[PDB]
Symmetry: D2
Subunit: 74 residues, 4 copies
């Protein structure tokens, strides 16, 4: 409503809109859902995502974006 | 194989989490009205009507940060 | 040790999926239009002002089954 | 709009049952939060050792991972 809130909300929504579309247009992902135990796929992908020791929340969210399509779609 | 998939998820996750511009936008948001912020951001996010799963996941990432800011 | 925490999370997750009434209520929404259902369901979930992580996770469980199905 | 009221009430109860479960909150609070990768993988490995990879279980792990990493 207020002008300060409307602008900060707009900028934040666009930034999250951009990251959201990057996940949905991830072509390496779209090809992976297409030897296929979902648990093993999840653990092999999850192991590779965190092999460098960095376990941050954005990576976990991306991992569960992957898990949702892996479980529900395929 | 699994490598390129996990690298792209690594790359997008590190954009959601370590983009300094995005983090300081999230940090500035009203910390004592999480319900009100969540719906304002969600309304602009889906004002174009495209209700894609990638955008819903990013919204839930922002909600998790809102609940953390209030905690 | 962590076997009890994993067993409890196991129980929670299986109780969600095996809740037929929940599955039926989720399968009874205008699937032609996901955005309006999400905002309607979410608006009624937080009218209390009770914006907790638990409720957000329950909305996430519903939103996924709504969009990806 | 009563079918949406009934569903919303169900999800409200599920979320509040999670957060008010003192035994669950105690078990979550006891893990080594300084070792999130090790904790997350040990819990996930035990949660899926039986071969059931259903979506409800993945969300329960997601509820755990969020409290493990954010707080
Ligand atoms: Zn305005
Ligand atoms: Zn980008
Ligand atoms: Zn304020
Ligand atoms: Zn330690």
């Amino acid at each position: 409503g207020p002008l300060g809130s409307d602008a900060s909300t707009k900028k934040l929504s666009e930034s999250l809109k951009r990251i959201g579309d990057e996940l949905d247009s991830n072509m390496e992902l779209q090809r992976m859902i297409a030897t296929d135990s979902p648990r093993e796929v999840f653990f092999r992908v999850a192991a590779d995502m965190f092999s460098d020791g960095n376990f941050n929340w954005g990576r976990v969210v991306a991992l569960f974006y992957f898990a949702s399509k892996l479980v529900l779609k395929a």
